[PDB]
Design a protein around this ligand. Structure first.
Ligand SMILES: N=C(N)NCCCC[C@H](N)C(=O)O
Ligand SMILES: [Fe+3]
Lengths: 319, 336
């Protein structure tokens, strides 16, 4: 797995640009910052731009990491209690912007209007409210036609080095018969809850919500397939014995290939949502303000493709 | 409809940039050039970048033009007799690079493997032996308007047309959808899967090969569209400001669907009467949203003497990975 380790000079240039941008724009609520993202991202170290572009275009690895960023722990401040009601942007604005720049290099930043007040940058930290653990892994929103193309996870802090799980597909482990079955629309993938704590928009998912169209698991190249796998919310018709058999073999290959990848402080992990599944590992959280803290941006290659489910032309938020 | 006119200073800087890049890279066959495109495009005048970003994000107008480029006629040379058998890249390489930079501001340049040897920037100029055909390489025949590759799930999102020369000022026709001109009932019908859109012959899996497992799977989605003839909408996206895919020549309205037939005739009438003539003269670059505009071209008499109208064209996708099933390798930008 290709990775990029920034020099102190690169790390300094990235930190500097990050602070200069945070001082010139109010928030992501600012329309012009969103406009300017790609032009602004062209001000990053050329080596960093080149690296990410090669990852995107190679379309070969499920994940990559840019390491050795300088995240000012004093400035960033203590890991907060909750995301809700919290004033945005916080002191860690610089780092959020960084992930936004990285997102514009990859595609476009987007979010879910219900998820975390619909903030384009998502918080990942322990919460006592939403607190024997089952080690699960998945494609992000595997059911959804407009699911992420890429995920960017920036580790602000990770004092106990709690890894992330990420796994890819090994084809040589599967027969040509199983693969062919997996390409066919013979599988149900259920949605997700995310409800409670606008009709023409809503009645769109209703094609999956009422009729429930069977979709494939593998698509793209047949020699190097993409995947959408969420074993927890996946269903197969009982009478489709071929499909169930091919689903078992696919699970067994992916499950056994899972790797632990640590996003330590200063790391930014890039997950290709079409080539890799990811997951959480359980950990003992302190709640004192020193807890592991990641930020997360969802990237779409094609914003306009989701227009039917977006409120207006301008909004990057779905639903 | 917004456009951008370059100051002479801006035109000079663009020209200088494209000359520099022309010397620094060998050809579009160089993978590093394709990689570098978006970063290189950030060296364009900031006004231009902002303008095109705003066109892209606004997602409202169906075309725009950037006017007033300096395309050096002496360096560019005579309009060729044919696209086959030319030294690649030619003396007009700086202009091709320009369009590639613009494509990277909008999305990703891509092509069709069967079209002009898979060249990402293709030529539009009269070819004598092609005089009797309805194509870009023709002249005498009217190129009637349409969405490019209406049938194809991976058709262009944008088209970039750059006029190297146009001595007789032959306009391009482009048309948009005035939604206020249609009934709410017609719109609802046009949003419904009630229309059959046939592929252009170039896209036929029996037309191009095929033979071997690998090449067969690359056309399996198209073959299945040919076998099952699914019906689809002519309008999609947002009901208040819809995208369209309209190719009158390849659209079949089912005989028994009276509602669809009424709405299609309504849609056709609006678009046909909204048709605008837009002249891309020397130094003009035309941007067409393939989801909001139709385009065509007027007939003209070619001279075949090296002085003919000459346009360069780039197709743009907003998502190269969507067409992965139809591309040979991960790296290729060629479909088929
Ligand atoms: N074919 C190769 N290797 N070209 C490298 C030159 C790119 C340098 C870039 N245009 C610049 O001036 O920064
Ligand atoms: Fe997840």
């Amino acid at each position: 797995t290709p990775s990029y380790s920034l020099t102190p000079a690169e790390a300094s240039a990235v930190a500097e640009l990050t602070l200069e941008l945070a001082a010139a724009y109010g928030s992501f609520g600012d329309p012009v910052l969103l406009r300017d993202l790609p032009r602004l991202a062209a001000r990053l170290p050329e080596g960093v731009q080149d690296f990410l572009r090669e990852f995107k275009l190679a379309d070969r690895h499920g994940h990559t990491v840019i390491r050795g960023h300088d995240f000012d722990q004093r400035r960033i401040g203590p890991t907060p209690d909750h995301w809700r009601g919290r004033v945005r942007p916080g002191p860690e604005f610089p780092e959020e912007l960084l992930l936004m720049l990285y997102s514009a290099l990859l595609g476009e930043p987007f979010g879910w209007a219900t998820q975390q007040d619909g903030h384009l940058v998502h918080d990942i930290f322990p919460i006592r409210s939403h607190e024997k653990q089952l080690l699960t892994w998945h494609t992000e929103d595997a059911f959804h036609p407009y699911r992420s193309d890429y995920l960017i996870l920036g580790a602000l802090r990770n004092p106990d080095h709690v890894p992330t799980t990420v796994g890819e597909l090994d084809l040589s482990s599967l027969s040509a018969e199983d693969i062919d079955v997996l390409f066919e629309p013979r599988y149900h993938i259920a949605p997700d809850e995310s409800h409670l704590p606008e009709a023409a928009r809503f009645a769109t998912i209703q094609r999956m919500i009422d009729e429930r169209p069977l979709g494939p698991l593998l698509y793209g190249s047949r020699l190097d397939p993409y995947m959408r796998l969420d074993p927890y919310f996946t269903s197969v018709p009982q009478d489709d014995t071929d499909a169930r058999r091919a689903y078992d073999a696919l699970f067994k290959v992916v499950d056994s290939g899972m790797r632990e990848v640590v996003a330590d402080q200063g790391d930014v992990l890039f997950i290709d949502n079409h080539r890799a599944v990811h997951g959480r590992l359980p950990f003992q959280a302190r709640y004192d303000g020193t807890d592991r803290w990641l930020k997360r941006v969802c990237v779409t290659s094609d914003l306009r493709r989701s227009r039917e489910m977006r409120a207006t032309s301008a909004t990057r938020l779905l639903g």
